[PDB]
Amino acid sequence: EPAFNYAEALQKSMFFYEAQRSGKLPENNRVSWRGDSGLNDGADVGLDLTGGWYDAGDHVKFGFPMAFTATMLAWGAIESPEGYIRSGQMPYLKDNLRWVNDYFIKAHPSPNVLYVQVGDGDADHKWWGPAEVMPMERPSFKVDPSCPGSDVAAETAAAMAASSIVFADDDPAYAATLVQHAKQLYTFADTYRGVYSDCVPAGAFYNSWSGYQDELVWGAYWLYKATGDDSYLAKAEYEYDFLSTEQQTDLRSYRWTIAWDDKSYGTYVLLAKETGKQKYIDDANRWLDYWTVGVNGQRVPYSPGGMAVLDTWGALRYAANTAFVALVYAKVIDDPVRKQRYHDFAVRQINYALGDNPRNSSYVVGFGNNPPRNPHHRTAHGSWTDSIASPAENRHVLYGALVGGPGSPNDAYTDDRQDYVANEVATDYNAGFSSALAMLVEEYGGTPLADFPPTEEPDGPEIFVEAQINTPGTTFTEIKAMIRNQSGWPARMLDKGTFRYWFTLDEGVDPADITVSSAYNQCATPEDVHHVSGDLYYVEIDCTGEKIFPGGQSEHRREVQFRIAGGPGWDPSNDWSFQGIGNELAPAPYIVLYDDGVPVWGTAP
Numbered sequence: 230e231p232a233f234n235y236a237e238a239l240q241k242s243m244f245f246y247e248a249q250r251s252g253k254l255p256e257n258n259r260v261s262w263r264g265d266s267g268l269n270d271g272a273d274v275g276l277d278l279t280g281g282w283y284d285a286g287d288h289v290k291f292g293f294p295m296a297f298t299a300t301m302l303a304w305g306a307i308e309s310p311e312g313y314i315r316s317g318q319m320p321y322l323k324d325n326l327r328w329v330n331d332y333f334i335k336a337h338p339s340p341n342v343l344y345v346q347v348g349d350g351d352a353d354h355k356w357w358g359p360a361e362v363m364p365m366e367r368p369s370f371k372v373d374p375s376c377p378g379s380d381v382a383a384e385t386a387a388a389m390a391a392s393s394i395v396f397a398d399d400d401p402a403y404a405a406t407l408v409q410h411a412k413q414l415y416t417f418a419d420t421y422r423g424v425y426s427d428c429v430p431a432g433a434f435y436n437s438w439s440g441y442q443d444e445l446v447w448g449a450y451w452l453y454k455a456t457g458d459d460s461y462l463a464k465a466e467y468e469y470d471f472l473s474t475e476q477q478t479d480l481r482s483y484r485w486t487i488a489w490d491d492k493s494y495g496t497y498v499l500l501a502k503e504t505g506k507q508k509y510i511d512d513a514n515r516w517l518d519y520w521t522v523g524v525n526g527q528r529v530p531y532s533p534g535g536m537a538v539l540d541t542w543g544a545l546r547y548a549a550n551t552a553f554v555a556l557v558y559a560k561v562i563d564d565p566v567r568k569q570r571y572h573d574f575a576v577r578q579i580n581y582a583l584g585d586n587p588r589n590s591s592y593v594v595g596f597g598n599n600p601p602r603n604p605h606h607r608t609a610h611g612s613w614t615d616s617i618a619s620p621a622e623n624r625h626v627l628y629g630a631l632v633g634g635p636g637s638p639n640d641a642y643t644d645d646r647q648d649y650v651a652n653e654v655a656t657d658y659n660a661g662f663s664s665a666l667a668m669l670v671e672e673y674g675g676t677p678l679a680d681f682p683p684t685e686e687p688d689g690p691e692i693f694v695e696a697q698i699n700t701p702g703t704t705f706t707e708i709k710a711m712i713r714n715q716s717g718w719p720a721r722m723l724d725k726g727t728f729r730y731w732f733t734l735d736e737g738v739d740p741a742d743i744t745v746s747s748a749y750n751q752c753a754t755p756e757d758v759h760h761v762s763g764d765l766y767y768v769e770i771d772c773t774g775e776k777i778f779p780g781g782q783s784e785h786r787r788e789v790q791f792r793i794a795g796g797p798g799w800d801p802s803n804d805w806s807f808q809g810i811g812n813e814l815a816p817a818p819y820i821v822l823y824d825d826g827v828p829v830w831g832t833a834p
């Protein structure tokens with residue numbers, strides 16, 4: 230039977246993409262720890278740019294990798310719709326693709342204008358906290374004729390074109406809209422030549438290293454498949470001759486692999502598959518050979534454990550990308566030896582990621598044996614103090630996310646959230662990986678979990694009030710209260726909070742003589758007390774206007790010290806809210822906290 234349950238892995242991979250969503254989430258949201266976020270995206274330019282996916286463990290919406298991810302996901306669904314159908318994940322794949330494509334449509338207000346980034350890398354990365362309460366400004370960036378971006382425009386064209394093929398039978402109207410958009414974007418990319426990173430501040434994160442030549446071939450091919458227009462195939466084959474050669478020879482690049490930046494490698498296989506020309510077969514063969522048996526004595530580094538390690542960053546992402554394409558190629562090539570070689574290589578690399586390695590551990594969060602528990606992800610972590618170090622363990626399980634893994638050919642790895650090398654996660658990391666999984670499900674099978682996702686429960690009160698006796702007294706009660714917002718299911722703002730402290734009027738105490746004072750109060754200090762009925766009264770502290778959210782030391786809490794002086798006769802032992810308050814700060818269950826008038830914590834009399 231399947232060495233690993235590929236269907237379950239795919240099922241969880243689809244969940245990962247759902248957890249990366251930005252904007253107003255649907256009613257059917259499966260990720261209980263995710264809520265609405267980035268609701269003001271595009272506002273700075275008068276556009277609705279909400280939606281799309283957060284790139285990695287951060288909250289920037291990087292259009293280049295986002296588009297590539299979409300193209301790769303669509304490609305896998307086209308190659309193996311059966312894998313998706315059998316794992317019962319086809320509806321989730323479509324849902325995910327529709328989500329990102331709806332964003333691309335919004336980001337393309339007119340034929341030659343494409344918004345390629347929402348958020349600033351540096352501003353975004355300086356803060357460590359949940360997406361729902363991001364406190365910083367998020368700038369929108371775009372490319373147009375004045376400052377083009379052929380690479381990102383052609384990639385978005387390819388994503389929309391590829392995706393249209395997936396919706397073709399389901400929603401032909403939607404598929405038509407995507408094709409129309411892809412045509413415009415490609416014309417823009419072809420007419421106004423230029424590297425997008427020269428126009429938008431993405432160079433430090435997703436710089437266009439390879440340039441746009443590869444995207445022109447890639448985009449042309451996909452539009453050909455989506456339209457059936459021969460001119461596109463012609464365009465692709467023409468542009469193919471301008472692809473990068475290697476070092477000193479006239480041999481096209483074969484030492485890297487396909488990823489968010491370089492699509493050359495994908496076109497080798499795609500064109501070979503389409504035309505059957507020896508030209509493409511030679512290129513594709515050379516590349517895949519380098520990753521397996523080597524060419525001219527040179528071969529991609531391999532660990533003793535059997536992992537192909539291309540580079541330090543997202544090592545497993547590269548191996549998985551190659552594995553998917555090797556699986557596709559293995560089907561078109563006739564050579565029995567090459568077919569076996571490429572196919573077996575792909576299965577071995579994916580199996581390594583699922584647990585077949587020297588550590589005997591899965592590299593997919595929430596899957597298999599001894600998986601990573603602390604991926605470098607802000608929202609999954611759920612910090613409320615703007616610290617990557619607290620709490621020790623991530624508060625949520627980011628099911629399905631493939632981590633960077635071993636960055637050196639020695640199979641070494643440490644599950645450490647602070648290691649952005651080994652524990653980084655990203656939308657592009659799961660792209661080739663998912664497509665590979667779909668191919669494997671079709672071949673080896675597997676069964677998805679009937680009840681997934683699990684419903685997580687909070688690790689304690691999320692929004693509450695702690696209290697302690699600040700100064701002991703007989704004619705007064707001085708409390709030191711602390712409002713806390715450590716929410717994570719999902720993280721949410723508390724900007725309209727107030728709390729009540731009930732007390733019973735005592736014999737010999739005139740309510741008119743009761744005073745409430747403070748020497749330190751981050752909220753308002755009331756002048757009077759409120760009579761409920763009989764001898765029941767309450768003091769109300771008003772914190773409306775204070776933004777209490779899980780995003781920093783001072784941000785997540787509000788300190789309130791208040792003294793209720795009643796004079797001789799004052800007796801707190803018959804006071805409702807006094808029950809259980811001691812000398813140590815601890816949750817006060819009898820002090821009720823309200824959010825815009827609605828009880829959120831504590832029990833009233």
Ligand SMILES: OC[C@H]1O[C@@H](O[C@H]2[C@H](O)[C@@H](O)[C@H](O[C@H]3[C@H](O)[C@@H](O)[C@H](O)O[C@@H]3CO)O[C@@H]2CO)[C@H](O)[C@@H](O)[C@@H]1O
Binds near residue numbers: 439
């Ligand atoms: O020159 C070698 C090949 O480079 C490819 O571009 C890669 C860059 O060289 C590499 O530094 C960059 O690393 C990224 C990584 O992709 C990203 O996922 C991670 O989060 O951050 C890294 C930087 O810190 O990756 C790109 C893409 O592989 C060219 O695409 C290729 O043509 C060229 O031969």
Ligand SMILES: [Ca+2]
Binds near residue numbers: 438440444
């Ligand atoms: Ca490129």
Ligand SMILES: [Ca+2]
Binds near residue numbers: 803
């Ligand atoms: Ca009393």
